[PDB]
């Protein structure tokens, strides 16, 4: 239905009548199909900016009678359901946790034949770890009838077993505090149906029907419709034994009043017994409408079943009557979601879903909008209320109430409702709702916390990293479409914050990502959408870094082609701390040279003198490399500064060991001799000089290369934890810590995994831990290899040579001589 901003806002004020949930389901189990049905049923539409569909708004109304069955404070008969989108495959670990973290309920889809598959079992655990209340749905029932032609009793036993499996997981992993959260068909928390045909039901649905034909309060009618309850046709009495006084069998209530009706319509219709169909149909009061009347076979059954048992409503029933509102859940989820004092002024405000308290808005992910290459923040307001214009504190990943690092006190340009693909502006938004923000893109990479309390900690952060550690070269298979690739690459980078496309000096088109899979996906979407043109992709490669271990053996010197200008310099190491400091905004290129000097001098042991002479950082004018101007009385010096800087930008982007980026390289310009006339000291002259002197300096300062290393966090049952250490020991992994979740048998191993050893990691971890393991890995740090990049046989040299060959460069690494003056 269509709603006005007022209706929505109004609806968003009654948080007691809101439901934040997700759908845990394997893609091959009608996940997409079921979800749709809810949209095609309760999908909210507003009465020119498009976004990437992240959440769908659902509206559902119930009777004052139904509202009472809700064992949790409510108000009104209207309900707002926020269906937050989930990934397709589990490998998306990090973002799976993302959606869960912002939801309270969960519609777990299980299969009739297959039951609970491994993947769904894993996500469920995770959901349970966030204290998500589950609600089950056994899908693909049709496949049971049509295919297996199973009996009423056998299908019953099946659901029984299935529900049993689920609860084995629910009880084993849910929190004792939460209370019994197991699903019980008799309690209306388990629905059965078929996404294909579009039908589904709950015991509570047939119980409201047969409600009076027996003179019962549905409480006891649905209680009988499951388990061991029998109705003797002859005695016309209810018994608790599968046999009558004589010893003859008795059909179960479920088989009698639920499965039988359905089983007949199937048998009737699929056998084309036109004499029965009409009769059978009128009995269930199913009125075909004109055109549908002539249908037969699947076509028919499909329509009958939809009118009979509307799949959408069965699910919408459990969502409202059993899934917690953003009020019931935040009371027991707050502490877990706040990384501050469990009694802190905010943590409390979270528990009480207090719209008056200081803002506590959680940003789960940044979503791509049509409005430029800008991204709108997606999240949930756990406390206080967010409003357009409101100025907020945007606390990034590294923030800590103590310092001022990673903070951005800015103003929220616009608040909008994430109506699936379209956004709808709204003044404010009180705690308990999923909302979207406009204007944070340049402050929040992906995840983050928005607050108002100056003493507010961040909320359970989701580690993400924008460090391009894996990249490939993209080429068009048919040269004609070249411009079509040049566009898609530009398009791709525009859709994802963490993908990167650039051109190497060699003129190649590069695509670099967060990891094997992340890149993989990006490449698919490029050859299929952004460019849709056939491409030649090179094999996956790990991004390394070139660095120095000491000061240059001797001064490095280079002269321009004029042979009129000279640059004397030396290269020396930068301390990881400083590098990190640069990488972490502490030491900043845009700062006041003086202020920044003070910092480096004080906190990092740098001569305030040198630090005040920083000429530039690099690459991209902000990397962990620097050029210090240590010259003395060099006339005209400033007139070649832009060139020198420029040179530095290229020298640091592609170093001399094998074209990789430089890291932690300090370049000290000791001297410079220039031609009196400017004509002869142009860019064409200095740029190459500097670039070459730097290379020289570097190659003399004892060259070494760094490899990137991941920090993988793994969830896994004590039983399968064996497979973890098993694989880690075949990848040069280094275990950092292993812990256990108090109650459950769920260990959580954290280790260091070299990125150049992570290829096909998940796949191998799969086999190893029977698929019970759930990985979450992020970039952690750069590791300097000990071996000599210059010695081909050494370990680093091995990397270097291969790389060089790959790039079709001279097999051997250039000696410093090649770049030093040819004197």
């Amino acid at each position: 239905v269509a709603f006005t901003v007022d209706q929505m806002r109004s609806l968003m004020d009654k948080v007691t009548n809101v439901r934040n949930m997700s759908v845990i389901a394997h893609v091959d189990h009608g996940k997409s199909t079921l979800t749709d049905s809810l949209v095609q049923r309760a999908g909210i539409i507003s009465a020119g900016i498009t976004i990437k569909s992240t959440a769908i708004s659902l509206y559902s109304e119930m009777s004052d009678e139904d509202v009472k069955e809700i064992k949790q404070k409510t108000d009104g008969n209207s309900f707002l359901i926020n269906l937050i989108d989930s990934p397709g495959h589990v490998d998306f670990s990090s973002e799976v946790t993302a959606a869960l973290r912002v939801t309270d309920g969960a519609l777990v889809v299980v299969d009739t034949i297959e039951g609970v598959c491994v993947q769904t079992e894993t996500v469920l655990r995770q959901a349970l770890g966030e204290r998500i209340k589950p609600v089950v749905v056994i899908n693909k029932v049709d496949r049971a009838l049509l295919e297996l032609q199973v009996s009423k009793e056998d299908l019953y036993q099946t659901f029984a077993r299935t529900v049993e499996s689920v609860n084995v997981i629910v009880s084993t992993y849910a929190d004792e505090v939460l209370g019994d959260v197991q699903v019980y068909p008799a309690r209306g928390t388990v629905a059965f149906g078929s996404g294909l045909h579009g039908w589904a039901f709950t015991i509570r649905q047939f119980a409201t029907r047969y409600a009076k034909k027996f003179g019962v309060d549905k409480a006891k009618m649905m209680d009988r419709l499951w388990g061991d309850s029998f109705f003797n046709p002859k005695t016309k009495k209810w018994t608790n034994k599968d046999t009558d006084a004589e010893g003859k069998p008795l059909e179960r209530a479920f088989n009698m009043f639920i499965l039988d009706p359905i089983f007949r319509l199937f048998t009737a219709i699929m056998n084309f017994k036109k004499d029965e169909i009409p009769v059978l149909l009128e009995k269930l009061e199913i009125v075909l409408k004109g055109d549908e009347k002539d249908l037969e076979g699947k076509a028919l059954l499909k329509v009958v079943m939809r009118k009979f048992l509307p799949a959408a409503d069965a699910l919408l029933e459990m969502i409202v009557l059993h899934l917690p509102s953003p009020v019931t859940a935040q009371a027991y989820r707050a502490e877990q979601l706040y990384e501050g004092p469990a009694d802190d002024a905010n943590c409390i405000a979270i528990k009480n879903c207090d719209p008056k308290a200081d803002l506590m808005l959680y940003v789960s992910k940044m979503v791509p909008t049509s409005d430029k290459g800008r991204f709108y923040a997606f999240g949930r307001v756990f406390a206080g209320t967010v409003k357009s214009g409101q100025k907020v504190r945007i606390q990034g990943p590294n923030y800590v109430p103590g310092k001022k690092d990673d903070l951005f006190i800015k103003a929220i340009q616009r608040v909008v409702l994430m109506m699936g693909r379209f956004v709808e502006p709204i003044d404010d938004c009180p705690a308990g709702n999923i909302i979207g923000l406009v204007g944070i893109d340049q402050f929040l990479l992906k995840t983050g916390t928005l607050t108002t309390s100056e003493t507010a900690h961040n909320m359970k952060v989701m580690k993400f990293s924008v460090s391009p550690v894996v990249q490939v070269a993209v080429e068009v298979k048919n040269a004609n479409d070249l411009p079509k690739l040049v566009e898609g690459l530009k398009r791709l980078s525009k859709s994802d914050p963490c993908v990167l496309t650039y051109m190497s000096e060699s003129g190649e088109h590069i695509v670099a990502g967060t990891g094997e899979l992340h890149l993989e996906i990006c490449l698919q979407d490029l050859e299929h959408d952004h460019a849709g043109v056939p491409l030649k992709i090179s094999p996956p490669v790990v991004a390394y870094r070139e660095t120095v271990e000491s000061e240059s053996s001797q001064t490095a010197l280079s002269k321009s082609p004029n042979k009129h200008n000279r640059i004397y310099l030396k290269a020396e190491p930068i301390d990881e701390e400083v590098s990190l400091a640069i990488e972490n905004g502490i030491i900043n290129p845009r700062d006041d040279f003086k202020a920044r000097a003070r910092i480096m001098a004080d906190d990092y042991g740098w001569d305030v003198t040198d630090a005040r002479k920083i000429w530039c950082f690099g690459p991209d004018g902000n990397g962990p490399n620097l050029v210090i101007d240590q010259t003395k009385a060099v006339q005209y010096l400033h007139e070649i500064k832009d060139s020198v800087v420029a040179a530095f930008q290229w020298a640091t982007k592609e170093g001399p060991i094998f074209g990789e980026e430089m890291r932690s390289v300090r370049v000290n310009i000791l001297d410079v001799t220039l031609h009196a006339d400017a004509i002869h000291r142009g860019g064409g002259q200095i740029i190459p000089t500097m670039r070459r002197a730097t290379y020289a300096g570097f190659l003399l300062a004892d060259p070494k290369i760094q490899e990137p290393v991941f920090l993988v966090e793994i969830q896994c049952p004590e039983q399968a934890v064996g497979g973890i250490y098993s694989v880690l020991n075949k990848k040069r992994g280094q275990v950092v810590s292993e812990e256990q979740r108090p109650g459950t048998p769920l260990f959580t191993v954290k280790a260091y995994l070299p990125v150049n050893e992570s290829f096909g990691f998940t796949g191998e971890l799969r086999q190893a831990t029977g698929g019970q393991a759930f990985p979450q890995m992020v970039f952690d740090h750069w590791s300097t290899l000990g071996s000599d990049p210059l010695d081909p046989t050494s370990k680093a040299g091995e990397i270097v040579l291969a790389a060089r060959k790959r790039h079709g460069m001279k097999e051997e690494v250039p000696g410093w001589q090649e770049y030093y003056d040819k004197l």
Partner: protein
């Protein structure tokens, strides 16, 4: 076409596309068979290279008062190598490498190739160059070769007329994309190209 055969030739920072030593040997042989001779190397930028090879060398708005106006080239690829690169940075700041070109003239023009020991660019030589070519500068259907500067290597200046009658093709001598500004490395010159690179013997006395 004097490029021998084997697929379109282009200039890349990556290297010259489709130009093996073998093809070079064929195109050279064929240029001699039509009566052309090699006289030197000419280094310059990719854009430029392309123009010269497909379109030929052509003067364009010279300073008519410029008496040493012409097309400079060099017997020694090393000396030419030095000009094989952008002379100014692109907007971003990159100075990419260039290409080395092999310059050929109709053998029928050798009568106008002269040599001197004096150093070209200045006045002291002007008179002597003019003495050797038989008319006041600039050079026209003639060429002068001499030291680029005292003790330097030698450069050759083909007068614009003569220059426009050249036939230029790629060298199998590659410029280095990862060392722009470095000096040509003698071992990167193909031994086979070295074989077909002798220079004609220029006259030292007027005609």
């Amino acid at each position: 076409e004097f490029l021998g055969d084997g697929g379109d030739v282009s200039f890349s920072t990556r290297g010259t596309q489709n130009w093996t030593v073998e093809r070079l040997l064929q195109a050279h042989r064929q240029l001699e068979e039509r009566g052309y001779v090699f006289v030197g190397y000419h280094g310059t930028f990719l854009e430029a290279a392309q123009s010269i090879v497909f379109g030929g060398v052509r003067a364009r708005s010279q300073d008519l008062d410029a008496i040493w106006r012409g097309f400079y080239i060099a017997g020694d690829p090393a000396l030419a190598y030095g000009y094989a690169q952008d002379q100014e940075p692109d907007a971003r700041g990159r100075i990419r490498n260039g290409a080395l070109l092999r310059v050929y003239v109709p053998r029928s023009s050798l009568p106008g190739f002269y040599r001197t020991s004096l150093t070209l660019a200045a006045p002291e030589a002007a008179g002597e160059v003019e003495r050797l070519i038989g008319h006041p500068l600039p050079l026209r259907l003639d060429a002068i070769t001499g030291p680029e500067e005292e003790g330097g290597r030698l450069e050759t200046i083909l007068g614009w007329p003569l220059a426009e009658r050249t036939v230029v093709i790629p060298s199998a001598i590659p410029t280095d994309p990862r060392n722009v500004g470095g000096d040509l490395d003698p071992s990167s010159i193909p031994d086979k190209e070295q074989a077909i690179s002798a220079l004609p013997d220029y006259a030292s006395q007027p005609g």
